[PDB]
Every structure is written in structure tokens, then in C-alpha cells.
């Protein structure tokens, strides 16, 4: 039986902190290989590191794999966790058929994948909800701590996005932002975010 299983739900870990991705396999072959791949939001599949069955624990760059042969468990760990490290990660198994060794006709056995979204630690939180005017409108939630969850809208008429990390390479200033809008004429920017848990210090502009 040849199989690979990744049980992990999407994991969120802050920058500069370590995260571990669990992958366990079942294989009948005496010698084999384990691969880890990184799938970017652009759907680009990138190789990371390879763990040999009889090889020692593989560590290359910022990637490290903890290999337990008896437990049949490989665990990828990203130590630095940059913002560009946000991707869905996959665990693959080299699958033999011929008994004499691996062939170029052989394939990878993929796990379900585990998505990783890193949280930038916000230096100076300034939570507020601003109302933007269109060219012819939208409420905006920005400058909030990354420890804050964004719950999606309860009303089907109103739409709420998730947090988005903006980075100005000049000012070296990073910010989280969310966007909420509705087709309702009288809908207001005070009520919109009610379902989400938000800081009590959240600022609102004087309406006009």
C-alpha cells in the first residue's frame, strides 16, 4: 500500500517564529524518498528538500526535516518564516514499481497539502475604520494588530474580505487591511464589522 497523509488544517504562525508541518506515509518499499514542495498563490510548484530513506536527517537552508523511520513520519520545519513563505505545502513520496530500482517513469504520491499563512507582527497598532468615496462606496479597516481575527459577514447582502498585508519598501512600514462593501444605499460603516472581534480602541471618523 502506497499512501501519504497530511492531517494539518491551515496553520498560522507569526514571522521570526518556527512552524512544523506534519506528514506521515505508508510504503511497502525497503528503500524510498520523501519530497517536500511549495505551491505559490500563482500555482507555481517549487521543490524544497528531499529526505532519503537510508539518508540522515535532511536540512538545507532554512528548511529542516525530522525523519523517523520506524514511525514513518517526516516533519518539515521553517525557522525564519518570512512573509514570502506563505504557500500551501505538500508532502510527496517516490513510488517504485520495478523491483530493481527507481525509474524515470515513476511518480510522486501527494498529500492533501497544508496551507501556511504567516502573520506580520505589528509594531504600532492604530485600529480604525475609514469610509472611502467612489468615483461616480466602501468601508475600510486598516492598521490593526495581526492578532485580530476577521470574521466574514453574516448578511449575504454585505461582503467582507480577509486581512491583507501591505508593505512599503521605502518607509519600511507594514500594515494589515480589510475591505467591506454593500449594495445597500443606507448601509453604514459603524455597523459593518460587528461579527468580527475588534479592539475597543478602534477609531471612527466624525461622520459627514
Amino acid at each position: 500500500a502506497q499512501k501519504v497523509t497530511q492531517a494539518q488544517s491551515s496553520v498560522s504562525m507569526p514571522v521570526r517564529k518556527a512552524v512544523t508541518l506534519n506528514c506521515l506515509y505508508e510504503t511497502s518499499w525497503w528503500s524510498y524518498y520523501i519530497f517536500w514542495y511549495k505551491q505559490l498563490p500563482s500555482k507555481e510548484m517549487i521543490f524544497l528538500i528531499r529526505q532519503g530513506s537510508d539518508e540522515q536527517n535532511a536540512k538545507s537552508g532554512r528548511y529542516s526535516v525530522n525523519f523517523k523511520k520506524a514511525a514513518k513520519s517526516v516533519a518539515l520545519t521553517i525557522s525564519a518564516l518570512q512573509l514570502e513563505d506563505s504557500a500551501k505545502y505538500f508532502c510527496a513520496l517516490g513510488d517504485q514499481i520495478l523491483y530493481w530500482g527507481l525509474s524515470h517513469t515513476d511518480k510522486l504520491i501527494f498529500g492533501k497539502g497544508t496551507r501556511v499563512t504567516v502573520e506580520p507582527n505589528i509594531q504600532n497598532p492604530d485600529p480604525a475604520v475609514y469610509q472611502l468615496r467612489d468615483s461616480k462606496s466602501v468601508c475600510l479597516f486598516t492598521d490593526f494588530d495581526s492578532q485580530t481575527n476577521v470574521s466574514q459577514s453574516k448578511d449575504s447582502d454585505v461582503y467582507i474580505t480577509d486581512k491583507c498585508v501591505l508593505d512599503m519598501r521605502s518607509m519600511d512600514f507594514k500594515s494589515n487591511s480589510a475591505v467591506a462593501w454593500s449594495n445597500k444605499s443606507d448601509f453604514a460603516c459603524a455597523n459593518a464589522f460587528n461579527n468580527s472581534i475588534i479592539p475597543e480602541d478602534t477609531f471612527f471618523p466624525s461622520p459627514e
Partner: protein, 238 residues
């Protein structure tokens, strides 16, 4: 990364952009959302033939080789379950399997389900301009299907990748419907003094992938082809 939209019961072509040093066997993988990637087949370059996984119908997948280094996978009798990201892959001397780019396929029963995005650019709030001293500008495209979209910010005739952020994946205007249109939002943040300069030009550009010239459209409205849709704004004097 390429986007292809095709109706059911038709054919589709998937191009492999992978650069292969030693060409022996070209593997084809399919990745569907919420599922594990799996190899559908591989091509034997020397013998020029297709080796299909068990359970697959012969003739469904065909890889054409127009040039020496060129490989294209052709699909027959498209169904909505053929939708997904298609990769081409090959082993290398390093004992690594390289996957060239990728292409997302979307198969729909009714070609009437494809809609171009309606883009709108929203001027920054004067409150944030005063309070934060930085002005945040928001562009959002709505009512577009399929998911394939590329949003780009253009300032003064030049593209700016800095100070901009876009949602990883679009929303669903109608969560109840599977073929429902998508909504996407993006953000651009600049200094207040830069925003308050009326000479500065801000344009939100959205690339959409629609029907082609070969696709037949008998409908009354405008043909939802591959289209560029932009919304622009100018700086405020204040």
C-alpha cells in the same frame, strides 16, 4: 501561469513551458482544489506514446509534440471535473521532479456563465489622510467568472508592486451557487503628499481571461472574451 476557459464536450490544449535538459519521459499532473495532486499520465518521448494510469479512458488524454522541445497535452470530451491546475513535470539528474509553471482549467456547461469584471477605484478617506498621514486607495472588481484575474496597479504610466496588496483568492458574490461570479479587492497605499498631487495619475488595471475568437457567441450582450478592464483616478488638491 496560464488561464484557459472551455465549454463542456469540447477540446482543450495545455502547454508545457518546462525546459528539459534530457527529454525521456514527460509527466502530467492535475491539481484540484481541496484534493491531492496526482499524475494522470506520462509521455514516452523515444517511443512517442501515452502511458495512462489505471481507470482512465484511452483517447481522453493526448500529448502532441509539434517541435523538438515542445509538449502540449490535449483533452477530449471536457467535463466540469476536468477543471483544475495542470502541470508538466520531469525528473532531473539531481533526483528532483521539476514542475514547469502551471495552467488553470475551468470547464463550464453553459458558456453564458462567463462575465467580465466591473472595476471601480475608490478615493482615500480624508480622515486617514489626517490621522495616519498616509492615504489608502482601494480598487475592487465585481461580477466576474471564472476565477482567472490579474490585478495590477499603474501610477503615472508605470506599474508599482510596492505599497500594494491584493486578496489571495476572490470572494463569492453568491456562496449558494457553484457557477456564481467572483469578487476581488485590492489596496494601494501612498503618502498623503503624493496623493494630494493632482498631476499624479492612478489606474487600477485588471486582466481577465475570457472566450477566444474561435469561441461562438450567439447571445445578445457583449462577448465575454479575454479583456482588459481598468478604472482610473487622479490626485485630490484637498
Amino acid at each position: 501561469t496560464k488561464s484557459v476557459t472551455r465549454p463542456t464536450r469540447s477540446s482543450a490544449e495545455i502547454t508545457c513551458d518546462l525546459t528539459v535538459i534530457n527529454a525521456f519521459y514527460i509527466h502530467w499532473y492535475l491539481h484540484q482544489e481541496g484534493k491531492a495532486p496526482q499524475r494522470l499520465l506520462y509521455y514516452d518521448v523515444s517511443n512517442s506514446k501515452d502511458v495512462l494510469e489505471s481507470g482512465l479512458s484511452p483517447g481522453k488524454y493526448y500529448t502532441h509534440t509539434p517541435r523538438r522541445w515542445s509538449w502540449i497535452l490535449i483533452l477530449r470530451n471536457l467535463i466540469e471535473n476536468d477543471s483544475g491546475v495542470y502541470y508538466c513535470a520531469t525528473w532531473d539528474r539531481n533526483n528532483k521532479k521539476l514542475f514547469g509553471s502551471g495552467t488553470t482549467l475551468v470547464v463550464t456547461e453553459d458558456l453564458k456563465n462567463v462575465f467580465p469584471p466591473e472595476v471601480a477605484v475608490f478615493e482615500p478617506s480624508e480622515a486617514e489622510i489626517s490621522h495616519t498621514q498616509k492615504a489608502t486607495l482601494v480598487c475592487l472588481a465585481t461580477g466576474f467568472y471564472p476565477d482567472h484575474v490579474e490585478l495590477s496597479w499603474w501610477v503615472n504610466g508605470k506599474e508599482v508592486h510596492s505599497g500594494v496588496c491584493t486578496d489571495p483568492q476572490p470572494l463569492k458574490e453568491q456562496p449558494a451557487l457553484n457557477d456564481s461570479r467572483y469578487a476581488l479587492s485590492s489596496r494601494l497605499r501612498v503618502s498623503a503628499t503624493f496623493w494630494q498631487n493632482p498631476r499624479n495619475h492612478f489606474r487600477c488595471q485588471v486582466q481577465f481571461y475570457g472566450l477566444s475568437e474561435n469561441d461562438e457567441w450567439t447571445q445578445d450582450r457583449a462577448k465575454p472574451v479575454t479583456q482588459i478592464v481598468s478604472a482610473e483616478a487622479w490626485g485630490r488638491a484637498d
